Amino acid sequence: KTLQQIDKLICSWLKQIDNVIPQLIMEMTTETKRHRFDLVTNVDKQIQQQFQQFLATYFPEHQLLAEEKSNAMEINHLWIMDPIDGTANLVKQQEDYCIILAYFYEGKPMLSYVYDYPHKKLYKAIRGEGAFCNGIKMEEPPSLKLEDAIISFNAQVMNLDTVQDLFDASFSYRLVGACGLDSMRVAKGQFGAHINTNPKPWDIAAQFLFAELLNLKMTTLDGKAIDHLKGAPFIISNKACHETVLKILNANGGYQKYR
Amino acid sequence: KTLQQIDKLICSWLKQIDNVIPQLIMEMTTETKRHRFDLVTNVDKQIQQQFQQFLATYFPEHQLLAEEKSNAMITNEINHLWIMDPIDGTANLVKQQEDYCIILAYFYEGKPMLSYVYDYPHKKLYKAIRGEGAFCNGIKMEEPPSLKLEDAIISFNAQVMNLDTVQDLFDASFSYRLVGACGLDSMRVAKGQFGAHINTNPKPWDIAAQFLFAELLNLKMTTLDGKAIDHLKGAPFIISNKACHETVLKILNANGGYQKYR
Ligand SMILES: [Mg+2]
Ligand SMILES: [Mg+2]
Ligand SMILES: [Mg+2]
Ligand SMILES: [Mg+2]
Numbered sequence: 001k002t003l004q005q006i007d008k009l010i011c012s013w014l015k016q017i018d019n020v021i022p023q024l025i026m027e028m029t030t031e032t033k034r035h036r037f038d039l040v041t042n043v044d045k046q047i048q049q050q051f052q053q054f055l056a057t058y059f060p061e062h063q064l065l066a067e068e069k070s071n072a073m074e075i076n077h078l079w080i081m082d083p084i085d086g087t088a089n090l091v092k093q094q095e096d097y098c099i100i101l102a103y104f105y106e107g108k109p110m111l112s113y114v115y116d117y118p119h120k121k122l123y124k125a126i127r128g129e130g131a132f133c134n135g136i137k138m139e140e141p142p143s144l145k146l147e148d149a150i151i152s153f154n155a156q157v158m159n160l161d162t163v164q165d166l167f168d169a170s171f172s173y174r175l176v177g178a179c180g181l182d183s184m185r186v187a188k189g190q191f192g193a194h195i196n197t198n199p200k201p202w203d204i205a206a207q208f209l210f211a212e213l214l215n216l217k218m219t220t221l222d223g224k225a226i227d228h229l230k231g232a233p234f235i236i237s238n239k240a241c242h243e244t245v246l247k248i249l250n251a252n253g254g255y256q257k258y259r
Numbered sequence: 260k261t262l263q264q265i266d267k268l269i270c271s272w273l274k275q276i277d278n279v280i281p282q283l284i285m286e287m288t289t290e291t292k293r294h295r296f297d298l299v300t301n302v303d304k305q306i307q308q309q310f311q312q313f314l315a316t317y318f319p320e321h322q323l324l325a326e327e328k329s330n331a332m333i334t335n336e337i338n339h340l341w342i343m344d345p346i347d348g349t350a351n352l353v354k355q356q357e358d359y360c361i362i363l364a365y366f367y368e369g370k371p372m373l374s375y376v377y378d379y380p381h382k383k384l385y386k387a388i389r390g391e392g393a394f395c396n397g398i399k400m401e402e403p404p405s406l407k408l409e410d411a412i413i414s415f416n417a418q419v420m421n422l423d424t425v426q427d428l429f430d431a432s433f434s435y436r437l438v439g440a441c442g443l444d445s446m447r448v449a450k451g452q453f454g455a456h457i458n459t460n461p462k463p464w465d466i467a468a469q470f471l472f473a474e475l476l477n478l479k480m481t482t483l484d485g486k487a488i489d490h491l492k493g494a495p496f497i498i499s500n501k502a503c504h505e506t507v508l509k510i511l512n513a514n515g516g517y518q519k520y521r
């Protein structure tokens with residue numbers, strides 16, 4: 001059975017990773033992918049590869065869907081990985097990036113991991129036990145109406161009218177700049193909601209479980225329910241401000257650029 | 260008294276407020292000021308009170324210009340001046356318990372001699388001592404690498420500018436992030452992690468420390484017109500890497516400027 005043992009294994013792999021990264025930084029190399037803002041490093045690739053390796057060693061039946069490798073891909077043990085979510089923050093700030101890891105058994109979220117390596121905070125989620133930040137149990141956050149909550153989203157990728165209407169309806173706006181971590185601030189009850197209008201499946205894979213066990217909302221921007229295997233325009237939200245955010249997003253002909 | 264003796268006293272009084280803040284947080288109470296979003300807490304108040312008490316107890320003749328008390332005294336002619344934002348980022352403190360800081364700057368006859376931005380939630384004390392340099396927990400900071408704007412993240416408040424100039428800043432910049440406390444957003448510029456941070460209406464206490472960080476680490480710190488800033492008064496302000504400063508100002512001042520109405 002237990003997830004609990006697989007979790008001990010995963011957590012001991014993270015301890016391993018913690019000692020590997022300073023080396024990977026030491027010889028850091030930087031490339032761009034499709035455009036000058038789409039960055040990859042040796043850090044991103046080596047973490048992925050090392051889990052690909054871990055998985056082969058201890059879990060050869062298990063498959064891996066992940067950002068820095070091709071995928072293809074009805075699957076029984078699936079891991080989803082963003083080896084460095086927030087690569088732009090790694091490169092420019094050496095701060096505010098994370099590892100995102102999530103395990104799915106017959107489509108159902110079983111374990112989930114967001115590792116804030118720079119602050120040495122490991123958020124984890126385990127079906128049957130709960131969500132934890134470095135061992136302390138995380139509890140359902142207090143209700144947050146939109147009008148009292150801080151929100152996070154990319155303003156660059158939306159028309160300014162609906163950016164305005166979000167500004168007007170919320171307490172304030174902030175942005176960390178990594179899905180995993182803005183999402184975690186919603187979990188921790190510090191942001192009311194996080195939006196990403198075009199995530200990949202690895203950008204959001206761990207959030208399903210956190211959301212389930214901490215009583216958050218996680219949907220498409222049409223309220224629907226997200227296929228973990230493909231992305232979708234998504235939101236993670238306090239329960240008390242979810243409907244309101246989506247309503248504003250879909251108003252006046254939608255959030256899309258131009259207009 | 261040797262600044263190193265004064266600094267020893269301050270770092271130490273900042274260090275001890277660690278023991279105090281947790282309990283003040285667990286009894287957090289909140290009042291409003293200019294309007295319902297202009298927040299102040301038991302935390303802001305007690306840290307200021309406890310500093311003023313410290314200053315009376317240790318440098319009787321010095322003076323405190325600070326956020327949560329009136330500053331009618333002054334004016335240009337005071338020898339020993341401290342300026343303090345007891346909690347900068349009060350909104351963040353209330354909502355997140357993270358990304359707030361304490362600002363202090365000592366000025367001897369107008370000239371900044373010591374500066375402190377204490378990032379309490381991650382326990383990172385930033386300090387700058389004239390003659391010594393700038394430090395983060397005693398790890399020494401040096402001038403950052405040149406950052407052109409299109410290679411740089413910027414930080415600013417997108418809600419108080421007209422959405423065209425906002426768009427223009429996005430467009431010309433690598434990306435946008437916001438921490439939401441001036442002192443911390445400023446420090447990211449100081450560390451070279453952001454190319455620049457803008458605040459279009461700071462008070463003296465939101466920017467008091469940064470003068471010296473900027474001088475010692477070769478940053479540009481100016482009004483949104485390029486001129487010197489008078490530390491007794493606010494101005495619309497920027498603090499920047501040297502390579503992106505002119506460009507950010509050009510963008511701000513174009514097509515009637517950065518105000519909602521141009
Ligand atoms: Mg990438
Ligand atoms: Mg990634
Ligand atoms: Mg205030
Ligand atoms: Mg303040």
Ligand SMILES: [Mg+2]
Nearest residue numbers: 344347348465
């Ligand atoms: Mg302030």
